[PDB]
């Protein structure tokens, strides 16, 4: 199937409490594989998946150097953005950045990403063409002008089309035991009385990977979109994910209800019913 690699970065200033905190993580698909935290005692890029541990010390030294450099540029940028937005040095502010690539089954680039936010709002993003920018406001237009002058987009495109794809391919092969295995959901339907006249039907999906999943309730073949409580897909803590969908049903009409489960680890989409 298709796959992705992403790096996420967050810098958060804390006036009066030292330099900004910097945290960056790397993922392949829904699997965390590297992290760096500026507040660690001896901050280094660290492995978080077994298949990356085999990379040699040259790899780890270089990835550490890149993270530390990003921490520094972010510190500088937080100061710059105070100027761009006419803000005081008193408050905490946040810079976020994500970049990476999606590849298809054949391993070719499907799409590249590089986008930034300040204080939780879009700041500047590389467009899908990997050659132009979208700036959210007049401050971000200053950055856009700088990055156009430094030919940032051309270098980013080179990375996204080159190393990003190539190393994603490398990781997928080295980690094929896990990265290329889908774990289907373990499913069940539970019944929870509310009152005389109604009860909750809850459809469970447990232990699945990757996170992408569709859980829907139907009443006599009709989608109960408006009346379904759907919790956010949540991590179990052991690579896998969990989710549930619930409907409130008039007691007696339970059999008019079926839960449907779609997951890439499922050959046929599943159909579940409540059973006492």
């Amino acid at each position: 199937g298709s796959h992705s690699m992403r790096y996420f970065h967050t810098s958060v200033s804390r006036p009066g409490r030292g330099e900004p905190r910097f945290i960056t993580v790397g993922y392949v698909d829904d699997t965390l594989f590297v992290r760096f935290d500026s507040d660690a005692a001896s901050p280094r890029e660290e492995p978080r998946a077994p298949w990356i541990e085999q990379e040699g010390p040259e790899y780890w030294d270089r990835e550490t150097q890149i993270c530390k450099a990003k921490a520094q540029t972010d510190r500088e940028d937080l100061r710059t953005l105070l100027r761009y937005y006419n803000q005081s040095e008193a408050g905490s502010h946040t810079l976020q950045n994500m970049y990476g690539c999606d590849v298809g089954p054949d391993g070719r680039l499907l799409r590249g990403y590089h986008q930034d936010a300040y204080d939780g709002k879009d700041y500047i993003a590389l467009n899908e063409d990997l050659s132009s920018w979208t700036a959210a406001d007049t401050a971000a237009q200053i950055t856009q002008r700088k990055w156009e002058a430094a030919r940032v987009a051309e270098q980013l495109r080179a990375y996204l089309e080159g190393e990003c794809v190539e190393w994603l391919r490398r990781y997928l092969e080295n980690g094929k035991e896990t990265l290329q295995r889908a774990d289907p959901p373990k499913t069940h339907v539970t019944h929870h009385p509310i009152s005389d006249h109604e009860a909750t039907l809850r459809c469970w999906a447990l232990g699945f990977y990757p996170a992408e999943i569709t859980l829907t309730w139907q009443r006599d073949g009709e989608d109960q979109t408006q009346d379904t409580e759907l919790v956010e897909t949540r991590p179990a803590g052991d690579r896998t994910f969990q989710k549930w969908a619930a409907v409130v049903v008039p007691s007696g009409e339970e059999q008019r209800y079926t839960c449907h489960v779609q997951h890439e680890g499922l050959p046929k989409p599943l159909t579940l019913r409540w059973e006492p």
């Binding site: 540029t73 500088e76 710059t80 700041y123 200053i142 270098q155």
Partner: peptide, 10 residues
């Protein structure tokens, strides 16, 4: 594998 670029500032 992270992207390397030099003194990229906003």
């Amino acid at each position: 594998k992270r992207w390397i670029i030099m003194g990229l500032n906003k």
